[PDB]
Every structure is written in structure tokens, then in C-alpha cells.
């Protein structure tokens, strides 16, 4: 009881957000909550760039240049290098192709709709209370109740589109 025990995933990468004390027990999720944490973190930074959109701190042509692969450092534009968090966006708009193309499309939906309907959002993967995956996975918004086994992954064929009975 004098050592600092954090916990990692496979291949030793730390789930950052904590650091253990010498006299604590680190909570460590497994295999379903990470896929719920990242969706919570995706909705989190969806709500981040709708706040900076409301706050009017960045130009409207800023995301166009990051899309086109043009990177302006803060040394170029006269302003101090860290006085805005400028390099936040260029990181989280270049995380992936399919990632950032949804993160903009979710935010422009969530900007106008909050400024004004449908009770639909993204899909949060529901888990059990143990921590594993619930074997049935329903997506409200479409009607797809499919099934997922073994630390994630759609088992093929088991898709159900708008039926009365739950897919056992």
C-alpha cells in the first residue's frame, strides 16, 4: 500500500483521466464501457464545438482550411501562440476521415436544433451492470435491433428492422 497502480488496455496504453494514490483501488472498465466512454467523449466534443460556435471565437472558414490540409500556426497570424486553444480543432478534425465528417455533421445538426422536434441522437451502446455487452443491441432512431457478442462486433445475419418482438 505504497505503490501507484494505474491500468491500461492491451499493448500498454493508459486510460488517461486519473492517477491512483498509494491507498486506492483503480476502477477499470472492460470491453463495453470504453465503447460507451468514447461515444460519451464524442458527444462531449460535439458539445464543445457547438459552444465555441455560440461563443464566436473562431472564423467560419477555419474548418475549411483544416479540411483542405492547410495548417496556420499562431506565429503566422500575429497572436500569441497559445492564447486561444487553436490547435485543438486541427487535431480533432484530423483524427480520421469518417470520424470528423460525422463530428461536424452532428454539430451542425445540434446547433440549429438547440437554437430552435425529433428526439433522436447518436447511438450509445448499452451495457449490462457487470460491464460486459448486453447480447441484444437496439438503436432507437432507425429501428435496428441487432446482436453483439464478445467484446464488441456485430455477429452476421442477426439484424431486425422494426419488429414487434425483441430479438432473442
Amino acid at each position: 500500500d505504497l505503490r501507484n497502480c494505474w491500468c491500461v488496455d492491451e499493448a500498454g496504453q493508459e486510460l488517461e483521466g486519473m492517477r491512483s494514490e498509494p491507498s486506492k483501488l483503480p476502477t477499470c472498465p472492460g470491453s463495453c464501457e470504453e465503447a460507451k466512454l468514447r461515444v460519451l467523449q464524442f458527444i462531449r466534443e460535439t458539445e464543445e464545438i457547438v459552444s465555441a460556435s455560440n461563443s464566436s471565437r473562431f472564423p467560419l472558414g477555419e474548418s475549411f482550411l483544416v479540411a483542405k490540409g492547410i495548417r496556420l500556426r499562431n506565429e503566422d497570424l500575429g497572436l500569441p501562440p497559445l492564447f486561444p486553444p487553436r490547435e485543438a480543432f486541427a487535431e480533432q478534425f484530423l483524427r480520421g476521415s469518417d470520424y470528423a465528417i460525422r463530428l461536424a455533421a452532428q454539430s451542425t445538426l445540434s446547433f440549429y436544433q438547440r437554437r430552435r422536434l425529433l428526439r433522436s441522437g447518436p447511438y450509445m451502446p448499452q451495457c449490462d451492470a457487470f460491464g460486459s455487452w448486453e447480447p441484444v443491441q437496439c438503436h432507437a432512431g432507425t429501428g435496428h435491433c441487432w446482436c453483439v457478442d464478445e467484446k464488441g462486433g456485430f455477429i452476421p445475419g442477426s439484424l431486425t428492422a422494426r419488429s414487434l418482438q425483441i430479438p432473442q
Binding site: 465503447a35 468514447r38 461515444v39 464524442f42 469518417d98 470520424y99 460525422r102 463530428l103 455533421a105 452532428q106 445538426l109 433522436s120 447518436p122 447511438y123 450509445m124 451502446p125 438503436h139 432512431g141 432507425t142 435496428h144 441487432w146 464488441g152 456485430f154 452476421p156
Partner: protein, 159 residues
Amino acid sequence: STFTETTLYRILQRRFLAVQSVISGRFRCPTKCEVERFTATSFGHPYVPSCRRNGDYQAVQCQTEGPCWCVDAQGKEMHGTRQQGEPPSCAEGQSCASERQQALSRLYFGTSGYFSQHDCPPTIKELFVDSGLLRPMVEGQSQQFSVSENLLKEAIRAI
């Protein structure tokens, strides 16, 4: 069991419809559209239908110098359309707006590609139209076919 599935019956319908090809231009009996077009042209009354060579009803159907609307494949009126003057545009290859909705619902589906990958039919593009099997049909030696492909899909159906 009965006279139907006997080979004496199915030769007779093949000998019937092969004569009906050089007589009527169809390798089939006339459907409901073509009978209603003939009995309207015979007695000369208005509302002659329109048949687009497939046996089904042509979609937009106008009557003589009057109102116009569009019809499904059964002979009944579409209620959201009666346009005097120009003919309407009912689903005439307008399948983008239905297909636009499938892309937007795929756009708004969570994140990270956990399932969104798994959301022409399967095993047809890589067995029939690519693997030398359709190439005997829509191909030949020269232009002297004019082989209608609502006759070959009637040829395999009736035979």
C-alpha cells in the same frame, strides 16, 4: 397429380406463346393494361390507357383533352396528383431522394464504425454480369437483333 404439371400441358402453352410472339410481339398473353387499351379504342370512348411495352401501366396517364394524373401498376389513381395541362412526374427514375435519406440516416449513426459498415443485390454482380453468363444474351454478331429485354425476361419466364 392433375393435368397442370403434366408435360402434355407445358408443351402446349409453349407452342401457344411462341406463335403469340410472331403474332402479337409478346411472348405472353396480354395483361390487364393491354385489354383495357383495346376495348377503349374499339368503342371509341375516352380514357384509353397507356402501356409501356412491359404489360404494366405506364405511370402518368392522361385522358383525351382533359385532366391528367398518374397510376400505379394496378390501374388505380394516385390521389396526390390531378394536374390539368402538363403531365406530372411520378417516380420516373427519381430514386435519389429516397436514397438520400439512407445516407443521412447512415451519417447520423453513432461514431467509430462499430456497426456502420455492416448496415444490385448480393452475389449477382460477381456471378452473372461479370462471369461470362449474361454476355451470350445482350451481345451478338451485329445490329440485326433489336432484342427487347422485356421479351427475353418474358422468354425465360414462359419457357
